[PDB]
Structure formats: structure tokens, C-alpha cells
A paper describes a structure:
Recently, [name], a low-affinity arginine transporter on lysosome vesicles, was identified as a direct sensor of luminal arginine levels for the [name] pathway. The bulk of [name] are 11 α helices that pack against one another forming a TM bundle that transports amino acids and functions as an amino acid transporter. The N terminus of [name], on the other hand, was previously shown to interact directly with the Rag-Regulator complex to activate [name]. Collectively, these results suggest that [name] is a “transceptor,” which is a membrane protein that embodies the functions of both a transporter and a receptor.
Author numbering:
A (entry chain D): 1 to 133, 137 to 219
B (entry chain A): 80 to 83, 104 to 159, 176 to 221, 237 to 246, 268 to 287, 297 to 370, 378 to 453, 468 to 519, ...
C (entry chain F): 1 to 215
The structure:
């Protein structure tokens, strides 16, 4: 089972550096090439440089010579890319990929590292449960997560049991603070008769909070 | 082929066709292992050095100088050349059969083969019909297939490069994904191949029995090797692929169904089969068929476990070339002298660093 | 550097129909076989390889994805369209030392029109006690993407301090959803009683209004 697992989201301060990793399980590491790719607002994919691990031979795109630095660890079968002195324009998602010489393209990819280049300091979120305002058929009830930074923010309903009827809207920035909201629509049979909770986790501020939706 | 009354012209031709054969297939991989520039230098020097040591053999079972530890010593290393060549014949007939047959079961590409329902990949399906034949020689009636293979093979290589051949860049000591450095630390691996490729010493005495002749012969031979080596290394599509992909049998950098290569493989298969039995008469002349099934068994076993043309040729050539090409012809000469000593010791040292440099990996 | 120009910019295909994304390369990307590749990327997820060497199908990809092309012009075709295909698709060239991608094609699956399940939510008291109050308003599972929400505080169209978010198109429903959180102060929230979440869409000429009174 070919698996590429990269690093966690990074909040690097403007002018600092970070190293992104990519642990490769499921194939013989050297029999393939490791590439790196950049995705920036909605559309715009850029090749970024790449390295044949057998002879340690990297090859970059001119645009990225001097930002990206490839390296590999043959024993750990991981690949690492260092980015240096970042600016606002370097806030992007970085992907890790896999190439065999020409007999294909980039067949297996990585989950993606999201680097956020900013000086706003990590603030933890405020979770507020959105109780329903009368009911009839089915009730949608919600949950508002307001005022957090950086963006890796994970929200589950009923610890994941409730996977269906969910709408986890993406985050927006207002005055260097994000706000996220989520809705779940269930039957008048199922609520308030059962327990429904908004589970919010901001790993970056070591914040794990649960918030139950109540009628008042 | 391989290692082992004339009006000079036919003498040079004969030395050429004898040293030509499946030996030329590994040259591209050798350059790649040293780097391009450093490899070219090595090919020239190693051509010149082996020529001097072949001269030396000409100026001389010999080996009275040593006796016992000399008579036996010449035999074992001469046996190393012979039995080592009977092994690589086995592997290459397998690959060529495999592709020659896979072709005739009912393609312009270059392949980076993944290193290791049709069951047509067997080296045992040829030992059964091919082992009695060396108990018997007449097979020398088909030496023309040696030239036919070499003729068609060279035609093949030129046709290919004309089609796709403009890809070079010069990363001198750094590396690129697609290009290897020009000076690579694996330069010893190239030297080992060349020793076995540049070896006629075991039979140059009988070959020259019919010196300007020899110099043109290795020059023609030496220049023949440099041609194939450079075309395949340069024409290897390098922006899309990489020059680290060059397989030790460069015909394996091509698919199972390259028609031109299949013609070359069929021709090489035709020629190669008409020459293995001779080595069986050759090995035993140097009382059951136990020895003689021993070399046959050695062929089959090698192709099924470790089938790299590159490692086999470099080790065997450096081994038998330690004595038969480097030290012994230099020892024969120096003792026969009952500044030059320093030079000839340096030749002795190269033959030593040749073998030791193959272990460094 | 090979510049790849991919069209359409944005494409809309009805479910069950055929989508023909196209790519054109500046230079030649054929070495001895063509070296363009097609990729699929759903929101927030890594890219997926559909067709390699312009016309060969990757193990596991549905045969409804087909590829053709050589030299300069290439096309990608999804012959029966499925809502699991609501993604953005790009093309890649692997032939020359600077590797380049394409403009991207955002495929939107046209489904039957559906109207929003609009639901309004008063400020949680846990916030009012911390100061501040926002009226969230979910508009879920609708089609098409375009929609307008007009917050009205005691009838007065208040458009200051509204903040929206849309979902990408559902991989199964082929629908969209939106959350409009109108944020006020605790003080200003208690200066008014009516809070309406007036939503207009293609489905109803008369806006679907969900409202509440503070008492």
C-alpha cells in the first residue's frame, strides 16, 4: 500500500524557515523519484524541484532556486524540503509526489502541508453552540467557532458518529482571526432526545473543547 | 569471440572480430558509472595500457620463471576468463531468447526496467537441450554470424541515435535528476569491464603467429568500443528519462518488442549459440562430464539468482587481468632483464587497485 | 519553458453527459511517446492521476475517463458524467527540465434545481455573557451556486458585519451550502428585536424568510 505522509501545518513568521517531511511506506524508496509541488489560491499548480534518491541528484525549477532545498534520508525513507526566508506569497499548500522515470507520471501523492506565512500570533477559539430557535419535520442545529489562528481546526459532531447531514463551512479571515461554522440536520425524532456535541480541536493552541447543543 | 601466413589486413580484421561480440553491450553503462568525461579518459588509457601488456605477451606455456606456482597460476586465471565467459553467455542467451520468443508470440521506446500468463522466462528450458553439446569441435564453422551480429548491431545503434540524439548537458561534479556528474566515484567499475573487453593475451601468441598489426588492431577495436559507448550515452533521452537508467546490457534499455533490436537479438542469439561449446573443449583441454556439466550448471544458476552483466564482467575481468594482463607480463619482462622498474611496478599497482577498487562500493 | 493552455476555464456538464477538457502545448511534449498527463483534484484533497502518457488509464480509474492527443493538442473526456466528478482537473508535462501544469478546469455538475433549507440561529448565551452576539444563518443543500442573503435588523437592511462562507459542490448531492454570520455587539443586539434572514434564489420569486424576535 503506497503511502506518503507529510508534516503538519506550519505557521512560520515572515523571514523564517521550515522543513517539510514526507515519510514513504509501501515501496522500495530508491526505485522511484520524489518530486514536490505547490498549490496557491484555488487554481495555480507549480512544479518545484525534485530528487532522484539513488544518486542524490536534485533538479529545481529556476523560479524556486534559492527558496526550495531538496534532501532525502535513505534510511528513514523520507524526503524533506526546506523553504527559506518566506513572504506572504509563499502561503500555499505543498504536495509531495512520486515518479518512476518516464513510464508514468506522479502516481501517488502526499496529504499536503499547508504553510501559513504570517506574524499574527496563535489565538485559541471560542466555541458557541447554535441552539435551534416551533419544530415540525427535521431540525438542523449548528455550531459557531469564532476567533482562532492558524487555520488547522478540526470539528466533529458526536465524536464522528454523526457523519451524515453535516456541512462544515470553510473558514474566513476577519481582522486576523478566523471563523468557522458547521451545521447538522437531523430528525425531530432524534433531537433533543439524544446527545449532540460540537467537538472543536485547535492543535496549534493545544485546545480541545466540546460544546453540547441545548434548547436554551 | 570475447577474449580468445596473414597479410596484415586479415590479421587486424581477425583480432577485431575475435574481441568483438557481446562484450560491446556493457560499454554505455560503464561510462555512466564513471561519469562522461572521466569515462572517455579511462577508455583511452585502458586501451593504451592493455596494448602495452599485449605487446609484452608477444615479446615472451611460458612461466618457467616461476614454475609450479607459475604454471598453475597462469591456468587458474586463464580458467577465470573462460568459465566466467561461459556464464555471461548463459545469461545473455536467456534474455535474447526470452525477447526473441516473446516477440514471435503474435516498438520505438526506451525503458528504465524495474529491477528484480506467459512462463517464457526460463534459463532451465535451455540447459536440458544445451549441455551435451560441449561433451563433443565443428561449431567454428559459424564464425560469420559473429560479424553478422556485429554488423547488424552497429547498424542498429546508428539508426537509433539518428532518430533521437541531441540530449547532453555538463553538470561537472554536481548532479541533476536527469544527468550524472562528469566525474563519478564509481570510475573503477568502468576499468574492470575494460580489462575483460581488452583481453586477447591468452591467445594473442597463437593469433599473431601469422606489431604494427597489433597497434592498428587494438586501435580499431578501441575506437569501435568508443563509438557505441558515446552514442548510447548521449542519445539516451535525458530530459524525459535519466542517464542513471542505462542498463548494463543496453539492449535491455529497450522494450520486449523492438523489432530492430529483435533482429539484433535474433542475430546475436544465432551467433552466440554457435560459440559456447568451444569453451567447453577449451576449458577441459586446460574423467566424467562433471567439470563439463559444472560450467553448464554455473551458467543456469547465475541467470536465475544474480543476473547483472555489469558486476560479473567487472569482477572477472579485473581478477584474471590482475595476473594475465597486469603483473605477470610485467614480471616476465623485468626478470628477463637479467626508471623502468618504477613504471612497471606502477602497472602492477593498477592491477591491484583494479581488484580492490571493485570491492569499494 | 513549455506553456500549457487549458480550456475551458470553467465547464458545466449535465449529469450523464460528456465533458471534453482540452490542452494545448507551446512546444512538443512527445519524446518517443507523448508525455502529457491528466490529474483530478477535489477540494482540500490531494491530486489524483487519471490518464498517463496522454491516453493510458491508471489502475483503478473508471473507464468513463478517456484520453487522447499527440504533439501539441490533447483532450480529456469524461464520457458519462457523475457528481463524484465535481472537481478541478489539470494537465502536466514531464518532458522538459522545467515541468509545467495547466490553467485548471473547474467542472460543475449541473443537477436538478433545489432550494435551500434555510435555518436561523440566535446568539448563544455563552457568547452574550462574554460580550458580543452574532446571528448565524445556514442555507444548506441548494442548486445552483449563486444565492443572495439579506440580513435585516428590525426591517433595516443591515449589510455591515455580515460574513459568508460557501461549500464546494457536494460529491453526492451536487449541491451547495452557505453560512452567513451577522456579528454585532451585545449592546447593539439588544437595541433591536426583529432579526430576519431573507434569502432569494432561482427557485422562488418570493424570498424564503426565516426570522425571529429577541423575546
Amino acid at each position: 500500500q503506497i503511502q506518503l505522509v507529510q508534516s503538519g501545518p506550519k505557521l512560520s513568521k515572515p523571514g523564517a524557515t521550515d522543513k517539510i517531511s514526507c515519510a514513504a511506506g509501501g515501496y522500495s524508496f530508491t526505485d522511484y523519484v520524489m518530486n514536490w509541488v505547490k498549490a496557491s489560491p484555488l487554481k495555480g499548480l507549480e512544479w518545484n524541484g525534485s530528487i532522484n534518491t539513488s544518486n542524490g541528484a536534485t533538479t529545481y525549477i529556476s523560479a524556486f532556486k534559492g527558496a526550495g532545498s531538496h534532501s532525502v534520508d535513505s534510511s528513514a525513507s523520507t524526503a524533506a524540503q526546506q523553504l527559506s526566508a518566506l513572504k506572504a506569497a509563499d502561503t500555499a499548500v505543498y504536495f509531495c509526489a512520486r515518479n518512476f522515470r518516464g513510464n508514468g507520471a506522479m502516481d501517488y501523492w502526499g496529504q499536503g502541508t499547508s504553510v501559513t506565512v504570517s506574524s499574527a500570533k496563535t489565538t485559541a477559539p471560542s466555541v458557541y453552540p447554535l441552539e435551534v430557535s416551533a419544530t415540525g419535520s427535521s431540525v438542523t442545529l449548528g455550531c459557531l467557532v469564532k476567533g482562532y489562528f492558524p487555520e488547522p481546526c478540526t470539528l466533529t459532531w458526536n465524536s464522528g458518529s454523526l457523519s451524515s447531514g453535516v456541512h462544515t463551512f470553510p473558514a474566513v479571515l476577519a481582522s486576523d482571526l478566523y471563523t468557522l461554522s458547521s451545521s447538522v440536520t437531523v430528525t425531530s425524532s432524534t433531537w433533543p432526545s439524544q446527545s449532540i456535541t460540537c467537538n472543536v480541536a485547535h492543535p496549534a493552541s493545544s485546545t480541545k473543547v466540546d460544546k453540547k447543543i441545548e434548547p436554551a | 569471440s570475447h577474449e580468445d601466413k596473414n597479410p596484415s589486413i586479415v590479421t587486424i580484421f581477425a583480432i577485431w572480430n575475435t574481441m568483438m561480440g557481446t562484450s560491446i553491450l556493457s560499454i554505455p553503462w560503464g561510462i555512466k558509472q564513471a561519469g562522461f568525461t572521466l569515462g572517455i579518459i579511462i577508455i583511452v588509457l585502458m586501451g593504451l595500457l592493455t596494448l602495452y601488456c599485449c605487446y609484452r605477451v608477444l615479446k615472451s606455456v611460458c612461466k618457467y620463471y616461476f614454475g609450479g606456482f607459475g604454471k598453475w597460476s597462469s591456468l587458474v586465471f586463464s580458467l577465470v576468463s573462460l568459465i566466467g565467459a561461459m556464464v555471461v553467455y548463459w545469461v545473455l542467451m536467456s534474455n535474447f531468447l526470452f525477447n526473441t520468443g516473446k516477440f514471435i508470440f503474435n516498438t520505438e521506446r526506451v525503458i528504465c526496467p524495474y529491477p528484480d500468463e506467459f512462463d517464457h522466462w526460463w534459463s532451465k528450458t535451455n540447459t536440458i537441450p544445451f549441455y551435451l553439446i560441449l561433451l563433443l569441435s565443428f561449431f567454428a564453422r559459424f564464425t560469420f554470424l559473429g560479424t553478422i551480429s556485429v554488423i547488424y548491431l552497429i547498424f542498429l545503434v546508428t539508426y537509433k541515435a539518428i532518430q533521437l540524439g541531441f540530449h547532453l548537458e555538463f553538470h561537472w561534479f554536481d548532479s541533476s535528476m536527469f544527468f550524472v556528474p562528469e566525474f563519478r566515484t564509481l570510475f573503477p567499475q568502468l576499468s574492470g569491464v575494460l580489462t575483460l573487453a581488452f583481453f586477447i593475451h591468452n591467445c594473442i601468441i597463437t593469433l599473431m603467429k601469422n606489431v604494427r598489426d597489433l597497434s592498428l588492431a587494438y586501435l580499431l577495436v578501441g575506437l569501435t568500443y568508443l563509438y557505441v559507448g558515446v552514442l548510447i550515452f548521449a542519445a539516451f533521452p535525458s530530459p524525459p528519462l535519466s542517464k542513471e537508467c542505462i542498463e548494463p546490457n543496453f539492449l535491455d534499455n529497450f522494450p520486449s518488442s523492438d523489432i530492430l533490436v529483435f533482429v539484433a537479438r535474433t542475430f546475436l542469439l544465432f551467433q552466440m549459440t554457435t560459440v559456447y561449446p568451444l569453451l567447453g573443449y577449451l576449458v577441459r583441454v586446460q574423467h566424467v562430464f562433471v567439470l563439463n556439466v559444472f560450467v553448464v550448471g554455473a551458467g543456469v544458476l547465475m541467470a536465475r539468482f544474480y543476473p547483472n552483466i555489469g558486476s560479473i564482467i567487472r569482477y572477472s575481468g579485473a581478477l584474471c587481468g590482475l595476473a594475465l594482463v597486469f603483473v605477470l607480463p610485467s614480471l616476465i619482462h623485468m626478470v628477463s632483464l637479467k626508471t623502468s622498474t618504477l613504471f612497471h611496478g606502477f602497472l602492477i599497482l593498477l592491477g591491484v587497485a583494479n581488484l580492490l577498487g571493485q570491492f569499494f562500493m | 519553458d513549455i506553456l500549457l493552455t487549458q480550456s475551458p476555464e470553467s465547464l458545466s456538464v449535465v449529469v450523464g453527459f460528456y465533458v471534453t477538457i482540452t490542452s494545448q502545448a507551446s512546444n512538443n511534449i512527445t519524446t518517443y511517446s507523448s508525455f502529457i498527463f491528466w490529474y483530478q483534484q477535489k477540494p482540500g484533497q490531494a491530486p489524483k492521476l487519471l490518464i498517463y502518457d496522454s491516453s493510458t488509464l491508471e489502475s483503478g480509474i473508471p473507464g468513463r475517463f478517456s484520453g487522447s492527443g499527440s504533439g501539441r493538442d490533447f483532450s480529456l473526456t469524461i464520457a458519462p458524467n457523475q457528481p463524484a466528478c465535481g472537481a478541478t482537473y489539470e494537465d502536466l508535462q514531464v518532458l522538459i527540465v522545467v515541468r509545467t501544469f495547466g490553467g485548471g478546469t473547474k467542472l460543475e455538475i449541473k443537477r436538478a434545481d433545489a432550494a435551500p433549507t434555510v435555518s436561523i440561529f440566535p446568539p448563544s448565551s455563552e457568547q452574550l455573557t462574554s460580550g458580543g452576539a452574532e446571528v448565524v444563518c445556514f442555507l444548506n443543500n441548494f442548486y445552483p451556486k449563486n444565492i443572495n442573503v439579506a440580513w435585516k435588523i428590525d426591517g433595516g437592511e443591515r449589510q455591515n458585519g455580515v460574513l459568508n462562507s460557501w461549500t464546494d459542490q457536494d460529491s453526492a448531492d451536487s449541491t451547495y451550502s452557505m453560512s452567513s454570520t451577522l456579528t454585532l455587539t451585545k449592546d447593539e443586539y439588544e437595541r433591536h428585536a426583529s432579526y430576519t434572514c431573507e434569502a432569494t434564489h432561482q427557485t422562488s420569486t418570493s424570498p424564503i424568510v426565516k426570522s425571529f424576535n429577541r423575546n
